[PDB]
Design an enzyme around this catalytic site. Structure first.
Site, PDB file in Angstrom:
ATOM      1  CG  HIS A   6       6.697  -2.669   2.073  1.00  0.00           C
ATOM      2  ND1 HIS A   6       6.645  -1.678   3.033  1.00  0.00           N
ATOM      3  CD2 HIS A   6       5.448  -3.184   1.992  1.00  0.00           C
ATOM      4  CE1 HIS A   6       5.411  -1.583   3.496  1.00  0.00           C
ATOM      5  NE2 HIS A   6       4.665  -2.488   2.884  1.00  0.00           N
ATOM      6  CG  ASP A  20      10.943   7.709  -0.348  1.00  0.00           C
ATOM      7  OD1 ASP A  20      12.139   7.520  -0.688  1.00  0.00           O
ATOM      8  OD2 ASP A  20      10.444   7.193   0.674  1.00  0.00           O
ATOM      9  CG  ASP A  21       6.223   4.624  -1.819  1.00  0.00           C
ATOM     10  OD1 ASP A  21       6.916   4.642  -0.769  1.00  0.00           O
ATOM     11  OD2 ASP A  21       4.973   4.681  -1.819  1.00  0.00           O
ATOM     12  CE  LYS A  25       2.476  -6.218  12.461  1.00  0.00           C
ATOM     13  NZ  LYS A  25       1.523  -5.768  11.360  1.00  0.00           N
ATOM     14  CG  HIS A  47       8.090  -0.780   6.114  1.00  0.00           C
ATOM     15  ND1 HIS A  47       8.362  -2.129   6.015  1.00  0.00           N
ATOM     16  CD2 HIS A  47       6.795  -0.690   6.500  1.00  0.00           C
ATOM     17  CE1 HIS A  47       7.279  -2.824   6.313  1.00  0.00           C
ATOM     18  NE2 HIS A  47       6.314  -1.975   6.615  1.00  0.00           N
ATOM     19  CG  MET A  86      -1.938  -1.105   1.004  1.00  0.00           C
ATOM     20  SD  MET A  86      -3.163  -1.087   2.292  1.00  0.00           S
ATOM     21  CE  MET A  86      -3.544   0.659   2.512  1.00  0.00           C
ATOM     22  CB  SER A  99       4.200  -1.868  12.109  1.00  0.00           C
ATOM     23  OG  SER A  99       2.953  -1.205  12.036  1.00  0.00           O
ATOM     24  CB  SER A 100       2.879   2.073   8.476  1.00  0.00           C
ATOM     25  OG  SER A 100       1.620   1.516   8.849  1.00  0.00           O
ATOM     26  NE  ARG A 101      -2.039   0.145  12.288  1.00  0.00           N
ATOM     27  CZ  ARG A 101      -3.189  -0.446  12.612  1.00  0.00           C
ATOM     28  NH1 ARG A 101      -3.528  -0.610  13.882  1.00  0.00           N
ATOM     29  NH2 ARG A 101      -4.004  -0.887  11.661  1.00  0.00           N
ATOM     30  CD  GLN A 150      12.021   3.205   0.223  1.00  0.00           C
ATOM     31  OE1 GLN A 150      12.430   2.272   0.924  1.00  0.00           O
ATOM     32  NE2 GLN A 150      10.941   3.917   0.534  1.00  0.00           N
TER      33      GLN A 150
HETATM   34  C1  LIG Z   1       9.012  -8.868   5.535  1.00  0.00           C
HETATM   35  O1  LIG Z   1       8.766  -8.013   6.660  1.00  0.00           O
HETATM   36  C2  LIG Z   1       7.648  -7.208   6.761  1.00  0.00           C
HETATM   37  C3  LIG Z   1       7.467  -6.517   7.961  1.00  0.00           C
HETATM   38  C4  LIG Z   1       6.360  -5.689   8.097  1.00  0.00           C
HETATM   39  C5  LIG Z   1       5.468  -5.536   7.088  1.00  0.00           C
HETATM   40  C6  LIG Z   1       5.634  -6.180   5.910  1.00  0.00           C
HETATM   41  C7  LIG Z   1       6.691  -6.999   5.747  1.00  0.00           C
HETATM   42  C8  LIG Z   1       4.595  -5.843   5.105  1.00  0.00           C
HETATM   43  C9  LIG Z   1       3.818  -4.972   5.777  1.00  0.00           C
HETATM   44  C10 LIG Z   1       2.645  -4.425   5.344  1.00  0.00           C
HETATM   45  O2  LIG Z   1       1.659  -4.395   6.085  1.00  0.00           O
HETATM   46  N1  LIG Z   1       2.579  -3.978   4.079  1.00  0.00           N
HETATM   47  S1  LIG Z   1       1.124  -3.349   3.520  1.00  0.00           S
HETATM   48  O3  LIG Z   1       1.299  -2.955   2.069  1.00  0.00           O
HETATM   49  O4  LIG Z   1       0.032  -4.422   3.628  1.00  0.00           O
HETATM   50  C11 LIG Z   1       0.581  -1.971   4.383  1.00  0.00           C
HETATM   51  C12 LIG Z   1       1.398  -0.850   4.473  1.00  0.00           C
HETATM   52  C13 LIG Z   1       0.948   0.270   5.162  1.00  0.00           C
HETATM   53  C14 LIG Z   1      -0.306   0.265   5.769  1.00  0.00           C
HETATM   54  C15 LIG Z   1      -0.736   1.397   6.459  1.00  0.00           C
HETATM   55  C16 LIG Z   1      -1.117  -0.862   5.670  1.00  0.00           C
HETATM   56  N2  LIG Z   1      -0.642  -1.985   4.954  1.00  0.00           N
HETATM   57  N3  LIG Z   1       4.359  -4.794   7.001  1.00  0.00           N
HETATM   58  C17 LIG Z   1       3.953  -4.012   8.200  1.00  0.00           C
HETATM   59  C18 LIG Z   1       3.332  -2.633   7.979  1.00  0.00           C
HETATM   60  O5  LIG Z   1       3.787  -1.915   7.064  1.00  0.00           O
HETATM   61  O6  LIG Z   1       2.426  -2.309   8.782  1.00  0.00           O
END
Ligand SMILES: COc1ccc2c(c1)cc(C(=O)NS(=O)(=O)c1ccc(C)cn1)n2CC(=O)O
Ligand SMILES: COc1ccc2c(c1)cc(C(=O)NS(=O)(=O)c1ccc(C)cn1)n2CC(=O)O
Ligand SMILES: COc1ccc2c(c1)cc(C(=O)NS(=O)(=O)c1ccc(C)cn1)n2CC(=O)O
Lengths: 288, 278
Positions: free
Chosen positions: B47, B78-79, B150, B44, B40, B186-188, B82
């Site tokens: 991703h 920026d995305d 995760k 980070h 999305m 996590s974005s949070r 990356q």
């Molecule tokens: C391989 O190690 C990891 C470690 C943490 C990871 C992931 C992979 C992938 C995610 C993730 O959820 N991606 S997302 O595109 O579904 C997304 C991004 C942003 C928001 C707001 C909602 N959903 N995340 C954690 C994260 O961003 O919250």
């Protein structure tokens, strides 16, 4: 991959077998046509097969599977006509090279789990009294499409609501298949072909012509408007002995949340004894 | 009739579903193995780990989708920078209108797992995710699709989607990237104030303690995790559950997964870990 003998009828029950053969065939340049049926084949199904056969370089896959998930309690599933021997005999006669005849366990090894939730159209007409029916249909059609991965898939127009919902499935899930609707094959008097016509006794068979007669009368009355078309169809249905109408409705062609313009579909469902018959026809208002 | 422009070894950006579908099919026909990494945006290190995992498949072309699903924050330039830095060749960046040209109509209804755990606070969340993931799989037709561990319940539901609808894709779970102290990425995380950020380490610390306690049995594992969470201030535990790897009931012995979720202030955090009970 399993054996495939061209020019002959190859019957597979395992989803993996047909998937492998289909993919191998597509990779050699043959285009794969799917005709998904619940068996008890009649000339209407054969029209679908012939349409499929007409596509240059086609290999035709006919699936036969009485899908439990589109029935509810009440005996309908056990009562569904099953004529396996006639079905396969007909496919051989038509030069079909693949029949796909999966088991319930192969299709539903985990029972009902992830399913397709159709749009609001599934709660109307045929779906009104049968809230999960179209979810069952779309779930199995999605599965058959993923197993076989055809270039085109073929359906009769008689179950027109089902056809519309299948087009919605294909659009909404971005499926890479072309949906081909084939006009309804009819008996000499106009009766829509159906695997359930066998449940009409001679009197009911005689009376059953009223559905198609009513629809064709409406299609011609339609130069005089919607009310005239509808009332013509009603008059014919009303004149018919022992026909109990469940609905008669004129809608836009996509049956969706828009009013009728020039082009419509008139749909009828009626009971003759315990046998429910459906039919539909294109309608042009005022007229074409 | 023409295939959209595709320049190998460069970042090719497509917003139209039909364009990405056509390029992916052309690439497939030339022998390339198509890998999909759905995101999305606001990319980070997690991703990037998914990307790197996809990249190492020989003959891979990597498609990274960036789509905010209204049904389930953005840095566009920026995305893409990356992804360019990672050697990604395709980014698919559709609009909401392009993904839902007919609005909400046919959707995926998950099985009863979607009602459990995260499905408590968000009963329709997983229907949204499964719907968009199905669409993305149908548009791109990847050989393999990559997700982080995760969101483990999400991952399990995707495997159910693939199994249930007979999809011909391989689902790859990639181990969760973590901060130096173990906090799952996590974005949070950036919303946590310093006290909350320090308290948040209790989630991973609890799970790893459980994983090691597990030689002493399931109860010791759960009790160890609970003790660690009980040592943290302002950590409101919503659940702490030991399940089998597919999220059914934990068997008396064998492999399982321990999942936790907690609220710190207004931020909900999740973590999970492999557990073995002998
Ligand atoms: C391989 O190690 C990891 C470690 C943490 C990871 C992931 C992979 C992938 C995610 C993730 O959820 N991606 S997302 O595109 O579904 C997304 C991004 C942003 C928001 C707001 C909602 N959903 N995340 C954690 C994260 O961003 O919250
Ligand atoms: C408007 O009156 C009703 C009455 C009963 C209904 C519904 C509406 C909707 C469902 C339903 O979605 N059930 S399900 O998720 O288990 C399922 C079952 C079968 C298939 C093919 C797909 N999904 N049900 C049945 C129920 O809740 O148990
Ligand atoms: C081109 O001429 C026609 C004329 C009539 C046709 C067909 C072709 C095909 C069917 C038919 O049934 N196909 S099906 O096996 O996929 C099926 C089974 C059950 C339900 C609910 C919906 N669909 N029928 C109508 C029929 O038998 O009643």
């Amino acid at each position: 991959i399993p054996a495939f003998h061209p020019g002959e009828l190859n019957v597979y029950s395992a989803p993996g077998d047909v998937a492998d053969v289909s993919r191998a065939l597509r990779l050699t340049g043959r285009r794969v046509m799917l005709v998904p049926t619940m068996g008890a084949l009649h000339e209407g199904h054969l029209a679908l097969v012939r349409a499929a056969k007409r596509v240059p370089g086609s290999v035709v896959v006919v699936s036969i599977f009485v899908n439990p998930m589109q029935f509810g309690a009440g005996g309908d599933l056990d009562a569904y006509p099953r004529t396996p021997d006639d079905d396969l005999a007909q496919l051989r006669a038509e030069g079909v090279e693949i029949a796909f005849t999966p088991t319930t366990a192969a299709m539903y090894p985990d029972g009902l789990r992830t399913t397709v939730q159709p749009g609001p159209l599934a709660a109307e007409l045929e779906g009104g009294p049968r809230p999960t029916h179209f979810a069952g249909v779309l779930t199995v059609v999605l599965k058959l499409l993923q197993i076989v991965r055809p270039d085109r898939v073929f359906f009769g127009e008689k179950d027109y609501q089902q056809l519309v919902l299948i087009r919605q499935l294909v659009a909404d899930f971005n499926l890479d298949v072309a949906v081909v609707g084939v006009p309804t094959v009819r008996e000499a008097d106009g009766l829509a072909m159906s695997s359930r016509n066998r449940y009409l006794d001679p009197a009911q068979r005689a009376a059953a012509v009223a559905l198609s007669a009513a629809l064709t009368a409406a299609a011609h009355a339609a130069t005089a408007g919607a009310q005239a078309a509808l009332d013509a169809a009603r008059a014919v249905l009303d004149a018919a002995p022992g026909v109990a109408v469940d609905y008669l409705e004129l809608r836009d062609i996509g049956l969706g949340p828009m009013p009728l313009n020039g082009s419509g579909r008139l749909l009828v469902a009626a009971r003759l004894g315990t046998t429910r018959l459906l039919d539909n026809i294109a309608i042009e208002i005022g007229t074409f």
